[PDB]
Amino acid sequence: MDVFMKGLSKAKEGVVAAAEKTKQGVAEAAGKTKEGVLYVGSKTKEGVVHGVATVAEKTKEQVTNVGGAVVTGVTAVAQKTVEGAGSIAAAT
Template sequence: MDALKKGFSMAKEGVVAAAEKTKAGVEEAAAKTKEGVMYVGTKTKEGVVTSVNTVAQKTTEQANVVGESAVAGANQVSEKAVESLETVVASTGLVKPVELSKQEGAVEQPTDAGQ
């Protein structure tokens, strides 16, 4: 009977030792899993931030291109309008063509009627 008790005692110790090792193994696996998940989360966050910054930069660049095109277009329209007005004024005889050529490039300042 002592041999049986001793055998069961050894078996019990073996089961306890195995359970402790299993517990340690599970804890280690959980820690590694947590590390892996945190790493993936960090890398995903970095990727999203980089993507958002890239999109914002490209949007800004495109907005600048559109703005520059709009300004260039407005300048062309205003130049053509001034040229057309000069032609109309000259053709109606209100101003002599010689006077227009002298004033080209010069900006006339409006006069104050009170002075």
């Protein structure tokens, strides 16, 4: 309710909640090595000028369904920029 402590209690659980995220992060991107010092027929220098230019298929097709969900942040903001307009009856 207090202007931002609504999001300064909810953020505390992108800190309770989204904690278990980069915790994995650290927890899990530290052993590249393991199979590193090993050799796999999955990279032969067309899985670079190909095996790189096809991880577009899954990363490409996030934003059909995040058509809205990186734009529903272009939903909820400039209606505080109308708690700007009604406020410069007051502010100024």
